[PDB]
Amino acid sequence: MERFLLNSTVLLYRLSTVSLDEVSLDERVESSVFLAQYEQARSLPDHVAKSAWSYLVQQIKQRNMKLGPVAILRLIAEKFIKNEKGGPKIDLPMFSEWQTLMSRVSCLPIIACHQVFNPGPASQEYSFRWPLYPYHPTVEDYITRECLHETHQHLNGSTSAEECWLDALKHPEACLRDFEKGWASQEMKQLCAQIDPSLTPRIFKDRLQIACNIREILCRVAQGVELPEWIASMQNPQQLANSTILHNGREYGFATVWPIDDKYSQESEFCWLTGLLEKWRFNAPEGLERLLWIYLLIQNQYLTLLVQRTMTELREETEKSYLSRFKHAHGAGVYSQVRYLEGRFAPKSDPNKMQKLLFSVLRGYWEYLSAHMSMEWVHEKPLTISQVLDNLELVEPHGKCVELALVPHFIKRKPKNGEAYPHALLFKDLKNQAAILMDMLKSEPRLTGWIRGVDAAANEMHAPPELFCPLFRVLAKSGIAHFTYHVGEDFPHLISGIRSIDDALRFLPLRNGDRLGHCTAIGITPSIWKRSLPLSLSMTKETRLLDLVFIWRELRSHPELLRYASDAAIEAVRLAHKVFSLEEEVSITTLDQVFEMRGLLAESEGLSLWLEEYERARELVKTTGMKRPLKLYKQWLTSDNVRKQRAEYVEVALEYLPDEAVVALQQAVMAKMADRNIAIECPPTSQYRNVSEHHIFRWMGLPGEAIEGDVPMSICLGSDDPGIFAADLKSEFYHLFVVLTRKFGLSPADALRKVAEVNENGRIYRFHDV
Amino acid sequence: MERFLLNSTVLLYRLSTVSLDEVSLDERVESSVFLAQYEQARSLPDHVAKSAWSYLVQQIKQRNMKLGPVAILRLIAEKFIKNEKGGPKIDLPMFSEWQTLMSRVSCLPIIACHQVFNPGPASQEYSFRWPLYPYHPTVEDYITRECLHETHQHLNGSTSAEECWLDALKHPEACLRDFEKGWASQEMKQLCAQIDPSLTPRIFKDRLQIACNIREILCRVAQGVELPEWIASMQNPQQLANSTILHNGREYGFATVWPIDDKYSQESEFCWLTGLLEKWRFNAPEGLERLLWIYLLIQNQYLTLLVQRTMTELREETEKSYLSRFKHAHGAGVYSQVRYLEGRFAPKSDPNKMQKLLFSVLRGYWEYLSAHMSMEWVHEKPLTISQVLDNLELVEPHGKCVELALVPHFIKRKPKNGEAYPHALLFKDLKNQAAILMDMLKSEPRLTGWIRGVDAAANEMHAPPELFCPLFRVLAKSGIAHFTYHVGEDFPHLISGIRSIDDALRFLPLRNGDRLGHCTAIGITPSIWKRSLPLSLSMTKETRLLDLVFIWRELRSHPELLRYASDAAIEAVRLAHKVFSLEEEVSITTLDQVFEMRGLLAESEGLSLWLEEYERARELVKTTGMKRPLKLYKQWLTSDNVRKQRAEYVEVALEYLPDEAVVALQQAVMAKMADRNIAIECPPTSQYRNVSEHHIFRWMGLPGEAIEGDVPMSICLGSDDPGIFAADLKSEFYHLFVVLTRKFGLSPADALRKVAEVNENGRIYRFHDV
Amino acid sequence: IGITPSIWKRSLPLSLSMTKETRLLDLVFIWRELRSHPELLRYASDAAIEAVRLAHKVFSLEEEVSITTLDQVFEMRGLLAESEGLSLWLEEYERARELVKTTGMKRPLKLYKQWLTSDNVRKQRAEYVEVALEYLPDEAVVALQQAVMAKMADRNIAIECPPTSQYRNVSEHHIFRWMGLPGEAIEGDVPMSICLGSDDPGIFAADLKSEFYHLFVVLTRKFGLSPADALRKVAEVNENGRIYRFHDV
Ligand SMILES: [Zn+2]
Ligand SMILES: [Zn+2]
Structure with missing residues (x-):
């Protein structure tokens, strides 16, 4: 429960609202904890x-x-973190619970409290490293031998949420x-209301600046410098909502001096907190x-809102953040801990911005390498992407450092109210971005060795995969090997997710060794897929009809x-009759x-490399006996009536099919997949009580989970x-172990x-150049 | 989903606050529903x-x-309720969902809408009856041939919460x-915050008065009478927070003539809502x-508060609520659906109020019996308890009507800061109440034929069973037949509840055929008992030590x-040494x-019917070798440091014992149950996702549920x-069926x-006299 | 749903003549059931x-009609x-208004009207067609039969059995096979x-009471x-009898 005292919206209100000399707030802290x-x-x-x-x-x-930050952090550190071998570590039994607490709390304060109140041997000068970790010699030797391989890094740009709070400051x-x-x-609206009811943007700014001011003041006291006299005027936390404090007539600025250049560095935070705690x-x-x-x-509230969620992304368009990710991915040892890194990045609409982002990433990788190997x-001092490449080709795949593969994101937005066919504007946007990518490759063909593969992300229902097939094929002919598309993560129905996955399989130009994504639909069981959800699920007519045809095709042989x-x-047949407003008899065929x-x-024909x-569609239309398919699909795409019918909603009764049938669908899907030799990225992520039910284990064949x-x-x-x-x-690695x-x-x-x-x-199905 | 539109606190807030002429609140209601x-x-x-x-x-x-309560109740009634055989009945596959819905909402409006919009044959004049039940010929034939048994009804006095609402108005x-x-x-306070953050008695009175005023105004529309003028002045709901409305200088009342004398009856509500819906x-x-x-x-929210929860019970001290209980318990047939009823009521500490309550219950029962039989x-027109007994002495156990059994409660409170021994003052209050009880019994020996047994109710941890044993023995000698004690309901640890149950067995004067109560500790499995609980659970030291003693006692032979x-x-041994401050060696023996x-x-001795x-203790003190036992017990009961360390808090691992071992302790307890012929009352109720997980089934031996x-x-x-x-x-009967x-x-x-x-x-272990 | 096919064909001619509608609905039913086994x-x-063939005849159909x-x-x-194709009765x-609204029901509705009204169709309904006595196997009969008892249990509908043509002895009585007697139940x-x-x-x-004695x-x-x-x-x-008594309670 401790992580309440560190993450609490009501307690946040109460503490920020009560005066500083009130004292004796134990009952209200307890009541806030219960709320x-x-x-x-x-x-x-x-x-x-x-x-x-x-x-x-x-x-x-x-x-x-006293009930305090130091008190709770001390209890937490004593309970969780031990110093062993090298640096502080996390007990093997408590690692999962520590992860659960991480889901709510920042670990920098905890780590500082650990160091101050029970430092390890005073012989290894410890430098801050996040996150904390457990120890197992077998695992350590394994990582030393083979290193780790990243393929799914798209949650928040490419970094952890903690540094983003400092970026905010x-x-x-x-x-x-x-x-x-x-x-x-x-x-x-709903996100913020459900996290913190009265969050609002003015209070957003107020909390941010209050946090800045508190950091400053606590840094002054940690350095033990004179407690400036406007502290006496400082009485109510709300006073920290302004850039200056008024003591008597004068407005005093809180700005002060910090030993380090990067005043917002995590290392600066850590040294400051250590000094404060040792003073305290x-x-x-x-x-x-x-x-x-x-x-x-405030830290924690901000970090949540962020995680549960473009210009705070643009500010990461320098060769500083990328170098940071690279250095972190590399361990404290000479050999990097990860062997092969996939660098996933959002494309922009402007060639200037793409060339900027690409130069930034490429340069940063170059500095990361130069900091480790001499030649x-x-x-x-490269200044252009061509120069950066010129530098980079000289590198050989020894494996001392990480190997980078760059993958642009394809963000699928919802269809808009007015367009010729569904998702037309989104398609135009993506075509623009892809053409720019193609032209940059044209200009610098060597980029084919660093931009390898394109991923198709964002909310699935906003767009079905078939929209991207021409994109993926055109990119392939451009020279983009490997492709990826998020499937099976969220869906109106599990059958719908399975159908979507097979749609991607049978439609996308996926070759041997390609990788799909979460594919949680074919992993989640129908036992654990419905545990607190309504007995019926409303969904779109188009989705229903596609899923029904999918059930048809898959179960025809069963x-x-x-x-x-x-x-x-x-x-x-009935849903097609209604959606297409059909009067003629139309066959499932x-x-x-x-x-x-x-x-x-x-x-194409019913509405250079695109030719x-x-x-x-030309050979299809040449096929004579496909009249009705042509006209019906044209109606599907263009007809206003058909489009409104497709958008319409209607229930699916939960037990439409037996869980055995659902499993049969899943297994047909795995059979087809394995036939086509495709992999599934599986990151640890709502309905699981504990991680133990994670479908990764069923995919992994564990007895009692595998079917x-x-x-x-x-x-x-x-x-x-x-x-x-x-x-x-490596945190996930340890989790699984x-x-x-x-x-x-x-x-x-x-x-x-x-x-x-x-x-x-992960190595085997790496997209990186060979 | 609809539950949220019919009960939403934040929705209540903003709709009550906004102007009545606001219009177009669709997006608003959407946000409300999501929140x-x-x-x-x-x-x-x-x-x-x-x-x-x-x-x-x-x-x-x-x-x-229009998005509104009308359409909502319409969709509900269509989706749930239907006319079959006699009156509306709930579709069988939907009963669990419907009782879940009733977990949050009331059916009066729903049934009104059903009767209004899809009435059955217009020949069975439909007098409202609650609740609404399903139909199964086997079930109805069984209830007719046999009839049912109320053994456990102590939730809201003995009434259902919905009537408490018209009581409040x-x-x-x-x-x-x-x-x-x-x-x-x-x-x-914690509850009021948790349910309604800004609840307060102020807005409490406000919402109550608003509710009554709404009732009156919509009565105006329902009777279709002239739409009085002050409605025009009425523009905001808060204007309904006052007993009168100021139109132009004049303050106009909200009250009127209503057709029925009892303006606060559920039947009045029903006929009214029917009229309103007919008009609308x-x-x-x-x-x-x-x-x-x-x-x-408001109706839903306060009903929620009430259920989850003295003078509101005191006002129920007339022979009206109890007559209503009896009539409700009896179906609409000549024969009562229940044969055997158990009437559980609190024994008051004032003899006058106790005899008041008892004459009330007896007079209500007699009048009911008159209302269904003639002699x-x-x-x-009886006036005294003696007179009503004279009346009832002529009643015979044919089975047409209900047969009542009266059980005084014993509400056990937490021990207070200062007392000679723990729970001493509570014991004194109970002794006072029991003295009163035996007084009335002495005065009227006949009462033994209607007060059959006493129950020990209230929160378990507030007092352990052993202190009641002298009470129960004294009462038994006075002439009280059968006893009951709530066990297994709430506990700090599962073994602790099991130990509580054993202690009750081995200390309370329970006889063959007696009953305990819920005993959920023995039904809940270790598997499904630890689903969201912390990996470590936390107890009082005294409880911890007693559980240790229990575990070793019971596992000696395994x-x-x-x-x-x-x-x-x-x-x-370790805990006893620290607790008793023992310097010497104390054996677990x-x-x-x-x-x-x-x-x-x-x-008794270490500190007429009581002699x-x-x-x-005289026999034990005569026992020679029990020296050390007695002195330690005296320390336990009295030593201030000892009571302090007893109150202090010691932690215990959630997985302190293997799941199988916990079940083994459970099985020792099941054996004791069967051996002593003690029954267990199992009503339907926090850790169960669906009702199918209910421990009731574990006892009933369902394959895959029985161990x-x-x-x-x-x-x-x-x-x-x-x-x-x-x-x-009968409702829960249908539920189980x-x-x-x-x-x-x-x-x-x-x-x-x-x-x-x-x-x-239930019949076999009736407390009723034979 | 009682008589077993085994004891259903004991003196019967090897072929049975019946009305064309009975034959057609029989075939339709047989399909509707046997899709799943x-x-x-x-x-x-x-x-x-x-x-399909028989409907092509009965409706004199020229286009193509699917079993669906x-x-x-x-x-x-x-x-x-x-109702709509030809107070409480309202x-x-x-x-039929909802159905006629149903757009995809065009062909069904027109066929239904033809069937109800068309004189040629009605004459063809009255017409007779033969069917082989062992048109389908006993196992198929009993599969259909057990599906029927399945729906019986599902809808909680009872069967009102008196005692009565083909049965040589009362021991041959179908009542027993319902009653689960070994060697009689399937x-x-x-x-x-x-x-x-x-x-x-x-x-x-x-x-x-007489029947009670007989059965006992x-x-x-x-x-x-x-x-x-x-x-x-x-x-x-x-x-x-009590349990499903109509008598009011
Ligand atoms: Zn993903
Ligand atoms: Zn109870």
């Missing part, structure tokens, strides 16, 4: 909270200390600008400790489900022929956990090689 | 809600309604007094539907857990002999669901019998 | 084909003729809530059940 649990962990049975709080307070009073105005530009959006080892002023309360609380760099297959046939054309470009696909009709699926790794701070690929060893009782060797197949598959 | 769903059902993944509301609005626009000031006296105590069949004024909306909301009644038993012994003395009365348990060593133990039924409105014993037949596929006969053995256990 | 899909396909469409035709046999007068059977009826066509002075004696002697066994079995149906 926080009621909001967050509703399931706790109303008495565990009171008991655990009686404890927490009891331990505090035993240790003769560095450009508070930029973050307010982004906050506001988006405050006009609907979705974030025996006792603390109440005003300042409450200040640190609100400081940590004649030709252009010692003797045990032919009843369901006939039902799918009948109901798909011709529906199927219509639906197999979904990969065709809208504007092939522009004519791709009889199952296959291997070439799972690969990816460091993208939506609801955590300061996560890493510990869960295997503990919950499944596998011996350390067993867990090691279990995870190792997925890791080495 | 309410987030706060209540957190698990739903953020998009199913969007789809569900999309289809809701699709329905509303297609069928051409009858005496709103009384509800205000009850609210405020209690609003000063913390736990209600095709359309209605926007502001008026909004007023109805707010009425319904000479002797005192046609060869497979001897390790665990030996541990428990060791840590028990000695601790056994100490803790077996717990049933001893505190003020026996005053001298009971290997399971033992039948005379489970009995109880109509007490903490989180539902207008619950009934449907659950068996569907989630386990059992045939109607199988489910009928499987519930029937429990029902008939 | 892996062991009878051949028969289901045969029925679909032949039903035939089903959509014959699913609407519950519609009132003069609701069923207008019920594997894929389900319980179906039988109730009694005192209606014997070919006797005088017969009563429910036959159970006891021909099947050797103990008195308790036979009494319990007979009761089952007897008190099922």
